[model samples]
Target: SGFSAEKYEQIQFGMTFDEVWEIGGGEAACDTGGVIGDSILCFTESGDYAPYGGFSFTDEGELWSKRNEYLYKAKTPSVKLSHYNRTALGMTEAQLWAAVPKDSCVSQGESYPNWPAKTGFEEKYYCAAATGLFPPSASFHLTDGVLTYRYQRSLT
Candidate 1:
């Protein structure tokens, strides 16, 4: 969903500003200003408190230097990855609500990825690990109120 040091390494010297834009997940929310030919494009991921990094492309118009931002902390998951058995593949949305306990590490939520706005939707059953957070969680894709697919990721 955002930029990180991993993507930063992919950017290299001599690459054009156009290329940098694509590598950084589109134009950043904010950019820098100074003398022409000397550019420092800043990329940041926050709202979740991410750091802002500056990519320095000298007047030559190629990537020359890069100043980086800080880190990201994944939101802690409330449920455990092992608790997924509470859910099944063909349950109605009502059944989903009923199956999961009202209080536990396991939690539920919905997301709509398409328009026309209501033919189908997603239900996420996110949980944590025994030791720490489970960055990825289970997602149930339901169409017309029945479970269809299950994947272990967000934005799926």
Candidate 2:
């Protein structure tokens, strides 16, 4: 079983590259199950996952199975974080109003395609609000308007 307590630590969110590489390319570690369980898990996990096809194959636990070497290699955290930070101040759909005052405010229910990826909740949410609708803390239909607020500035 590779998913032992030690292994679990490596697969967590925000894991450093070294941590992940250690488990994936390092010594034999268990996730939680034992030896047969590990192989079965990997096989089951990566057996038939086809993100391109919009579906993946799974095992008894409905775990996804991916074809070996089929997909793109994973990106490093350094690369991803760097990308996010580098493009923080990029424009959003609402901010497009800043360009043209007359057409600045969009009508409610107006569709905006290609709003750029990774705009994060703040920009998109604020755009939805600037439409002159919803409460101050209101957000538009981004992700069905699901908002993730920080506890410190969260409404008391």
Candidate 3:
């Protein structure tokens, strides 16, 4: 295998680029991005074709970089989103709460861009597991007190 979780942990920042090369045997080349791997230089167990997993790290040019379940991983937390069966474009925040009765979403106290928010509407973010797991989250727009837009986001 080309990638090594042990090697990933062995690498650190501020060390010379050469130092990093020794630990992982990586080529210090142009890292054109397509949002492909976990790190700028993704290392796989085998060369060229491996599912992107098993030990990755981020980079800071010459410097450097930035899981769980049960057993081999820690248990990941999940959130039950509000029921959407009754949600409508013209609903109010109160109705939203009524639908989101269980495992309520927490306001991020932040706003989103206007592209998703229509005229007379304000957009904001909320999440159930935002701080718990690879947080699943949602954001929506409310016009005066009426729901106007909604979105969902998450990572594994």
lDDT order, best first, reads 1, 3, 2
TM-score of every prediction relative to native: 0.36, 0.17, 0.35
Model 3, residue pairs in steric clash: 1-45, 2-45, 3-44, 68-73, 68-74, 69-73, 69-74
Stretches > 4 Å off in candidate 3: 1-82, 109-123, 129-133, 154-156
Q: Per-residue lDDT tens digits of candidate 2, residues 69-101? A: 112221211112222222223334343323323
Candidate 1 vs candidate 2, TM-score winner:
1
**Displacement of the residue 13 alpha carbon in candidate 1, Å:** 1.5
List pairs with backbone clashes in candidate 1. Answer: 37-59, 78-105, 79-105, 79-106, 79-127, 79-128
Q: Judging by TM-score, tell me the better candidate of 1 and 3.
A: 1
Better of 2 and 3 by lDDT: 3
Candidate 2, which ten residues in sequence have the lowest lDDT sum?
Answer: 147-156
Per-residue alpha-carbon lDDT of model 1 for 5-58, expressed as tens digits? Answer: 666667665677777767776645434465522454444555543564455554
lDDT on C-alpha atoms for all candidate structures: 0.51, 0.25, 0.43
Instruction: Indicate the worst ten consecutive residues by lDDT in candidate 1.
Output: 101-110
lDDT of 3 by residue, 1-156 (tens): 343545555655444455555665555421224563433343443444432212223343343222101111112223344354456678888887676542435332222223233234343435344354445655545666788776666522
Number of the predicted model whose lDDT against the real structure is largest: 1
The residue ranges of model 1 lying beyond 4 angstroms of the native Cα positions read 28-40, 47-49, 71-156
